[PDB]
Amino acid sequence: KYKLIVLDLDGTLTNSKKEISSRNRETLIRIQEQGIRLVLASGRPTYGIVPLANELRMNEFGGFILSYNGGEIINWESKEMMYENVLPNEVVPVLYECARTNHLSILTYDGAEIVTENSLDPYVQKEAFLNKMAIRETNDFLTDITLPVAKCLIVGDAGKLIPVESELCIRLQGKINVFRSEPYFLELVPQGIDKALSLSVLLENIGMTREEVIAIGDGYNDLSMIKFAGMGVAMGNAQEPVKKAADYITLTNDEDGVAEAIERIF
Template identity: 45%
Template sequence: MSEKNIRVLALDLDGTLTNDEKKVTPRTRAALDAAVAKGVTIVLASGRPTAGIMPLAKDLGLDKKGGCILAYNGGAIIDCKTGETLYQKRLDPDMVPKLCAFAAEQDIAILTYNKEGVVTERPEDEWAAREGFTCHLPMIQVEDLAAYVDYPICKMLITLDPARRDEVCAEGKKRFEGQIDLYPSSPFFIEAVPLGVAKDVSLGALLEKMGLTRENLMACGDGLNDRSMLAFAGTGVAMRNAEDAVKAVASDVTTADNNHDGVAEAIEKFILD
């Protein structure tokens, strides 16, 4: 039982809040509504672009009840009610051609986003297509991604066969050391973000804005990109289906996975007890 004063609940989406069909089930919705009724601010914290999170935020009623979207793995935080950007970090434009060249060399897909959807040279790539499915956004094919991106972006996403993830990530880290951060967010995704962009950093900035501390934060996640926020949060909960390295930094692990209301279990235990 918890006596913690949890005021902010940060939730990873894929593999955490949503089941494998990318849906939030009734029990989890009820738990979220009850937490909001207790004055808890919900933050949807994902590697997805803002446009890929907004429909879910609206579906959960956060545009009316209030709440935040933490997009691009911490590259931006948006107030769901007002649409105001509370925090943002952009990728250096010089990095776009460098990352595109790296992906071409490795013969893997790389993508980013525009206002309409996911832009890539390889929309038919099996792993790239998963981002379109995840975000419910259309895949837009461009001839030359580096030339196409003449607008500010928060991140790029490398997509690849899971068997190659760790080797390519290590190679990329070596290549771009001190220029950007690279880390996996799923078995087939590697995030390419500005230095210092991570879920814990932007959540820290949000808490400061709200006059709260990490003790007031509960975070739930399953992927390697959730480790920082679970370690940072006063209450860090890993899903049963989380990678082992994520469970290792969590203060609690649910008995249920993302397909069986793991998030509801965590909310009931720590916020609604």
């Protein structure tokens, strides 16, 4: 019946210490050994998902990474990228100048590294630590990044980010979307980002239907994929609307709710 499992990371696959429990690891490895393919889908850049994909041996089982909320779809075994929704290059200098004039740090990604002019900003380091990515500091952001980039973050105290968000929202209407993922992270992304849309594209490519998919998540940004999946699973720690939209409610992330759901469903 089911042929694909899609997992969010934070609040879902990982526990409160941001680790994959050995129960979740062994259950996910076993289900792949039985022929089920996995997808890790998250707002993180690709290399913030890579270590978890490696732990789950996804590079041996044709696993997919949907990084940047599905802005990229990458087969982690073949390394082939199927889908690339990235920022228009012309917006990047505008984002940089906005950060500069507001005395806030901007960062973006270049493979396994975060690129920024302020490696000593605690908010920049928070993004590096969550993703386990080294920081490459530069004194010339716009010349040292590699374009195109899938997103940038402007980071700082929430109070300082709100007006920057409110300005960029309208200034770059039609070119980007803006939202805060943590109070201190302003995400600057292309239009049309949605895990469910990217999943749809993935399914069309690998010849699966939505009825054949299990998707597991916890947050509002998981709602569309939980609705889209034939078997949408809310974590025990999920938001109430996500629970109401699900087909199945599992244990919390700290109680191995991912392993539990997979064992129960299969």
